[PDB]
């Protein structure tokens, strides 16, 4: 088998001329030439079978991506693994080779307002499809937004996704968690398990802010710091928004803080389009029940050049509603990947 940086990367003979391109969660990512389709592709190596939770993340993503089909979601082109469960130690997922991601881009490139608008449109167009399937991505952030050379955008990684469950979203103070820290909604730290669609809209709002200035808007240094950053910009929550928090520990924490004023968006972002900031404000709303939903966001004036609901498709087959041991999960991953065998 071909080796990359000392490790086995066993994808041939269809995929040749390998180059290391980065690191996944359970393995490395390489580019490779696809000798059938005569294009280069991205390949992620996954080694999950020793841990029930790794198997869970892997199965979840495979099951979601094999049902989804959307221009702004990166699909699975091929899955490579051994012919038998006994011999299967790794799984390789083959996907379109993109040019870069938004994390890398924002490290050195100023975006024009036209690029910001088109990127945000494509993020929300993909998210409309995801939420229409009753699925939550739960880890939206710049490094999960891939771009090709003509700035078409695709959402990566459904390993933390879940089926939405709003009736079972409530929990205690300081419990959860959901998402990468900088992109976590305030309610995660207060009273939410991250089981409603509003969790993803908060993350998109954080991404929009970061496109406006090339810096994360809420860069908390640790779990606890994240709420300090959010409230330092949004200011103190209103009485009405506090009353919506029935958990006493969470509500009394907020009541214990000195008053903080809101920082105006046009002071934080003085070169931004005013329609962009109006949409930013509606995505970064403290109360998740008042936060804008994905279809309202697509219809916002900032996106008027692109909005077209008949060209913003939804899922045909939403996901209707599982933790069990790794041996059954390995079996389930073997079965879910069978369609790609010769
Ligand atoms: C999508 C998530 C993602 O891109 C980030 O987590 C990366 O840091 C992961 C490693 C690089 C992935 C990559 C790199 C290039 O140049 C082109 C690609 O198409 C990809 C890619 O498809 O990443 C997928 C597998 C994960």
mmCIF file of C-alpha atoms in Angstrom, residues 1-210:
data_model
loop_
_atom_site.group_PDB
_atom_site.id
_atom_site.type_symbol
_atom_site.label_atom_id
_atom_site.label_comp_id
_atom_site.label_asym_id
_atom_site.label_seq_id
_atom_site.Cartn_x
_atom_site.Cartn_y
_atom_site.Cartn_z
ATOM 1 C CA UNK A 1 0.000 0.000 0.000
ATOM 2 C CA UNK A 2 1.102 3.573 -0.642
ATOM 3 C CA UNK A 3 2.389 5.407 2.425
ATOM 4 C CA UNK A 4 2.089 9.077 3.359
ATOM 5 C CA UNK A 5 4.237 10.624 6.129
ATOM 6 C CA UNK A 6 4.943 7.163 7.531
ATOM 7 C CA UNK A 7 1.282 6.050 7.614
ATOM 8 C CA UNK A 8 -0.664 3.627 5.438
ATOM 9 C CA UNK A 9 -2.919 5.507 2.970
ATOM 10 C CA UNK A 10 -4.399 2.596 1.108
ATOM 11 C CA UNK A 11 -6.611 3.875 -1.698
ATOM 12 C CA UNK A 12 -5.314 2.380 -4.925
ATOM 13 C CA UNK A 13 -5.199 1.514 -7.700
ATOM 14 C CA UNK A 14 -7.997 3.945 -8.686
ATOM 15 C CA UNK A 15 -6.491 6.831 -6.693
ATOM 16 C CA UNK A 16 -2.799 7.621 -7.346
ATOM 17 C CA UNK A 17 -0.278 10.509 -7.116
ATOM 18 C CA UNK A 18 -1.083 11.335 -3.485
ATOM 19 C CA UNK A 19 -0.267 14.644 -1.742
ATOM 20 C CA UNK A 20 -0.829 15.431 1.919
ATOM 21 C CA UNK A 21 -3.279 18.352 2.214
ATOM 22 C CA UNK A 22 -4.219 18.527 5.923
ATOM 23 C CA UNK A 23 -5.573 16.672 8.956
ATOM 24 C CA UNK A 24 -9.062 15.259 9.613
ATOM 25 C CA UNK A 25 -10.523 14.199 12.964
ATOM 26 C CA UNK A 26 -9.590 10.485 12.738
ATOM 27 C CA UNK A 27 -6.829 10.674 10.145
ATOM 28 C CA UNK A 28 -5.121 12.734 7.504
ATOM 29 C CA UNK A 29 -6.507 14.197 4.294
ATOM 30 C CA UNK A 30 -4.729 13.823 0.959
ATOM 31 C CA UNK A 31 -5.353 14.838 -2.613
ATOM 32 C CA UNK A 32 -5.124 12.147 -5.258
ATOM 33 C CA UNK A 33 -5.669 11.570 -8.936
ATOM 34 C CA UNK A 34 -8.858 9.649 -9.759
ATOM 35 C CA UNK A 35 -7.928 7.471 -12.746
ATOM 36 C CA UNK A 36 -11.574 6.777 -13.665
ATOM 37 C CA UNK A 37 -13.013 10.282 -13.549
ATOM 38 C CA UNK A 38 -9.659 11.839 -14.621
ATOM 39 C CA UNK A 39 -9.752 14.626 -12.002
ATOM 40 C CA UNK A 40 -7.972 15.122 -8.689
ATOM 41 C CA UNK A 41 -10.035 14.548 -5.511
ATOM 42 C CA UNK A 42 -9.819 14.887 -1.720
ATOM 43 C CA UNK A 43 -9.601 11.741 0.449
ATOM 44 C CA UNK A 44 -10.149 11.609 4.229
ATOM 45 C CA UNK A 45 -8.798 8.578 6.204
ATOM 46 C CA UNK A 46 -10.908 7.526 9.212
ATOM 47 C CA UNK A 47 -9.826 4.998 11.894
ATOM 48 C CA UNK A 48 -12.776 4.868 14.333
ATOM 49 C CA UNK A 49 -13.442 1.282 15.362
ATOM 50 C CA UNK A 50 -11.885 1.167 18.824
ATOM 51 C CA UNK A 51 -14.227 3.849 20.271
ATOM 52 C CA UNK A 52 -18.014 3.873 20.391
ATOM 53 C CA UNK A 53 -18.026 7.673 20.038
ATOM 54 C CA UNK A 54 -15.750 7.711 17.000
ATOM 55 C CA UNK A 55 -17.936 5.085 15.358
ATOM 56 C CA UNK A 56 -20.949 7.228 16.182
ATOM 57 C CA UNK A 57 -19.563 10.385 14.519
ATOM 58 C CA UNK A 58 -18.494 8.370 11.463
ATOM 59 C CA UNK A 59 -21.787 6.572 11.004
ATOM 60 C CA UNK A 60 -23.808 9.782 11.549
ATOM 61 C CA UNK A 61 -21.902 11.628 8.834
ATOM 62 C CA UNK A 62 -22.006 8.767 6.315
ATOM 63 C CA UNK A 63 -25.735 8.296 6.803
ATOM 64 C CA UNK A 64 -26.519 12.021 6.398
ATOM 65 C CA UNK A 65 -24.237 12.640 3.402
ATOM 66 C CA UNK A 66 -25.415 9.614 1.426
ATOM 67 C CA UNK A 67 -28.951 10.954 1.592
ATOM 68 C CA UNK A 68 -28.203 14.652 1.012
ATOM 69 C CA UNK A 69 -27.665 16.085 -2.462
ATOM 70 C CA UNK A 70 -27.084 19.847 -2.690
ATOM 71 C CA UNK A 71 -24.757 22.230 -4.563
ATOM 72 C CA UNK A 72 -23.600 23.887 -1.305
ATOM 73 C CA UNK A 73 -22.922 20.663 0.636
ATOM 74 C CA UNK A 74 -19.864 18.588 -0.150
ATOM 75 C CA UNK A 75 -20.974 15.095 -1.091
ATOM 76 C CA UNK A 76 -19.425 11.647 -0.831
ATOM 77 C CA UNK A 77 -18.109 10.467 -4.208
ATOM 78 C CA UNK A 78 -16.711 7.100 -3.109
ATOM 79 C CA UNK A 79 -15.971 5.159 0.067
ATOM 80 C CA UNK A 80 -12.980 2.767 0.262
ATOM 81 C CA UNK A 81 -12.575 -0.063 2.790
ATOM 82 C CA UNK A 82 -11.623 -3.756 2.991
ATOM 83 C CA UNK A 83 -14.054 -6.357 1.599
ATOM 84 C CA UNK A 84 -14.798 -7.966 4.978
ATOM 85 C CA UNK A 85 -15.562 -6.677 8.471
ATOM 86 C CA UNK A 86 -12.593 -8.642 9.822
ATOM 87 C CA UNK A 87 -10.123 -6.960 7.494
ATOM 88 C CA UNK A 88 -11.657 -3.455 7.842
ATOM 89 C CA UNK A 89 -9.531 -1.184 10.041
ATOM 90 C CA UNK A 90 -9.808 2.127 8.192
ATOM 91 C CA UNK A 91 -12.398 3.808 5.978
ATOM 92 C CA UNK A 92 -11.553 6.386 3.293
ATOM 93 C CA UNK A 93 -14.092 8.991 2.132
ATOM 94 C CA UNK A 94 -13.513 10.547 -1.325
ATOM 95 C CA UNK A 95 -14.880 14.069 -1.986
ATOM 96 C CA UNK A 96 -14.443 16.907 -4.503
ATOM 97 C CA UNK A 97 -11.081 18.621 -4.286
ATOM 98 C CA UNK A 98 -11.671 22.279 -3.393
ATOM 99 C CA UNK A 99 -9.119 25.154 -3.543
ATOM 100 C CA UNK A 100 -9.199 26.490 0.038
ATOM 101 C CA UNK A 101 -11.499 27.095 3.004
ATOM 102 C CA UNK A 102 -12.791 30.284 4.601
ATOM 103 C CA UNK A 103 -10.514 29.923 7.672
ATOM 104 C CA UNK A 104 -7.442 29.936 5.421
ATOM 105 C CA UNK A 105 -8.834 32.681 3.215
ATOM 106 C CA UNK A 106 -9.600 35.036 6.115
ATOM 107 C CA UNK A 107 -6.037 34.642 7.470
ATOM 108 C CA UNK A 108 -4.646 36.710 4.590
ATOM 109 C CA UNK A 109 -7.400 37.989 2.240
ATOM 110 C CA UNK A 110 -9.700 40.984 2.637
ATOM 111 C CA UNK A 111 -13.141 40.146 1.192
ATOM 112 C CA UNK A 112 -15.008 42.586 -1.020
ATOM 113 C CA UNK A 113 -18.615 43.230 0.003
ATOM 114 C CA UNK A 114 -19.622 41.320 -3.163
ATOM 115 C CA UNK A 115 -17.707 38.264 -1.913
ATOM 116 C CA UNK A 116 -19.211 38.554 1.557
ATOM 117 C CA UNK A 117 -22.731 38.700 0.138
ATOM 118 C CA UNK A 118 -22.189 35.716 -2.209
ATOM 119 C CA UNK A 119 -20.495 33.593 0.506
ATOM 120 C CA UNK A 120 -23.284 34.330 2.997
ATOM 121 C CA UNK A 121 -25.955 33.551 0.400
ATOM 122 C CA UNK A 122 -24.390 30.133 -0.330
ATOM 123 C CA UNK A 123 -23.993 29.299 3.379
ATOM 124 C CA UNK A 124 -27.711 30.054 4.007
ATOM 125 C CA UNK A 125 -28.795 28.243 0.835
ATOM 126 C CA UNK A 126 -27.040 25.046 2.004
ATOM 127 C CA UNK A 127 -28.306 25.541 5.554
ATOM 128 C CA UNK A 128 -31.915 25.885 4.265
ATOM 129 C CA UNK A 129 -31.591 22.384 2.800
ATOM 130 C CA UNK A 130 -30.002 20.950 5.978
ATOM 131 C CA UNK A 131 -32.697 22.413 8.262
ATOM 132 C CA UNK A 132 -35.458 21.325 5.850
ATOM 133 C CA UNK A 133 -34.254 17.765 6.492
ATOM 134 C CA UNK A 134 -34.793 18.314 10.240
ATOM 135 C CA UNK A 135 -30.995 18.152 10.701
ATOM 136 C CA UNK A 136 -28.710 20.548 12.655
ATOM 137 C CA UNK A 137 -25.085 20.901 11.547
ATOM 138 C CA UNK A 138 -23.959 22.035 15.032
ATOM 139 C CA UNK A 139 -20.362 22.945 14.094
ATOM 140 C CA UNK A 140 -20.519 25.684 11.461
ATOM 141 C CA UNK A 141 -17.277 27.743 11.367
ATOM 142 C CA UNK A 142 -14.907 29.075 8.690
ATOM 143 C CA UNK A 143 -12.734 25.930 8.450
ATOM 144 C CA UNK A 144 -15.900 23.909 7.543
ATOM 145 C CA UNK A 145 -16.692 26.149 4.531
ATOM 146 C CA UNK A 146 -14.757 25.039 1.440
ATOM 147 C CA UNK A 147 -14.272 27.211 -1.684
ATOM 148 C CA UNK A 148 -13.215 26.370 -5.216
ATOM 149 C CA UNK A 149 -11.242 28.652 -7.582
ATOM 150 C CA UNK A 150 -14.438 30.480 -8.651
ATOM 151 C CA UNK A 151 -15.690 30.967 -5.079
ATOM 152 C CA UNK A 152 -18.423 28.342 -5.104
ATOM 153 C CA UNK A 153 -18.923 27.338 -1.434
ATOM 154 C CA UNK A 154 -19.649 23.917 0.100
ATOM 155 C CA UNK A 155 -20.359 22.977 3.752
ATOM 156 C CA UNK A 156 -18.075 20.262 5.203
ATOM 157 C CA UNK A 157 -18.277 17.842 8.156
ATOM 158 C CA UNK A 158 -21.511 16.389 9.525
ATOM 159 C CA UNK A 159 -19.801 14.439 12.302
ATOM 160 C CA UNK A 160 -21.441 16.561 15.041
ATOM 161 C CA UNK A 161 -24.871 16.815 13.342
ATOM 162 C CA UNK A 162 -28.107 15.728 15.037
ATOM 163 C CA UNK A 163 -31.805 15.468 14.236
ATOM 164 C CA UNK A 164 -33.557 18.532 15.657
ATOM 165 C CA UNK A 165 -35.339 18.016 18.994
ATOM 166 C CA UNK A 166 -36.777 21.332 20.244
ATOM 167 C CA UNK A 167 -39.106 19.752 22.813
ATOM 168 C CA UNK A 168 -36.103 18.231 24.629
ATOM 169 C CA UNK A 169 -33.692 21.199 24.354
ATOM 170 C CA UNK A 170 -33.744 22.407 27.978
ATOM 171 C CA UNK A 171 -30.946 21.708 30.461
ATOM 172 C CA UNK A 172 -29.130 23.241 33.424
ATOM 173 C CA UNK A 173 -26.607 26.036 33.706
ATOM 174 C CA UNK A 174 -22.974 25.449 32.602
ATOM 175 C CA UNK A 175 -23.646 21.974 31.136
ATOM 176 C CA UNK A 176 -23.178 21.879 27.405
ATOM 177 C CA UNK A 177 -20.897 21.141 25.192
ATOM 178 C CA UNK A 178 -22.019 21.994 21.460
ATOM 179 C CA UNK A 179 -19.986 23.613 18.636
ATOM 180 C CA UNK A 180 -16.477 24.983 18.655
ATOM 181 C CA UNK A 181 -16.235 27.648 21.370
ATOM 182 C CA UNK A 182 -16.067 30.892 19.324
ATOM 183 C CA UNK A 183 -19.225 29.936 17.334
ATOM 184 C CA UNK A 184 -21.407 28.777 20.334
ATOM 185 C CA UNK A 185 -24.709 30.566 20.987
ATOM 186 C CA UNK A 186 -25.150 32.125 24.443
ATOM 187 C CA UNK A 187 -27.943 29.743 25.418
ATOM 188 C CA UNK A 188 -25.530 26.750 25.230
ATOM 189 C CA UNK A 189 -23.895 28.061 28.440
ATOM 190 C CA UNK A 190 -27.294 28.895 30.047
ATOM 191 C CA UNK A 191 -30.041 26.337 29.354
ATOM 192 C CA UNK A 192 -29.771 24.632 25.913
ATOM 193 C CA UNK A 193 -28.506 21.264 24.611
ATOM 194 C CA UNK A 194 -28.141 22.673 21.096
ATOM 195 C CA UNK A 195 -31.093 20.717 19.690
ATOM 196 C CA UNK A 196 -32.830 23.581 17.831
ATOM 197 C CA UNK A 197 -32.141 25.217 14.464
ATOM 198 C CA UNK A 198 -31.357 28.572 16.105
ATOM 199 C CA UNK A 199 -27.989 27.140 17.212
ATOM 200 C CA UNK A 200 -26.814 27.075 13.597
ATOM 201 C CA UNK A 201 -28.083 30.581 12.810
ATOM 202 C CA UNK A 202 -25.930 31.974 15.665
ATOM 203 C CA UNK A 203 -22.863 30.311 14.158
ATOM 204 C CA UNK A 204 -23.597 31.826 10.698
ATOM 205 C CA UNK A 205 -23.897 35.244 12.354
ATOM 206 C CA UNK A 206 -20.439 34.757 13.913
ATOM 207 C CA UNK A 207 -19.091 33.810 10.469
ATOM 208 C CA UNK A 208 -20.610 36.912 8.852
ATOM 209 C CA UNK A 209 -18.981 39.157 11.491
ATOM 210 C CA UNK A 210 -15.650 37.423 10.878
#
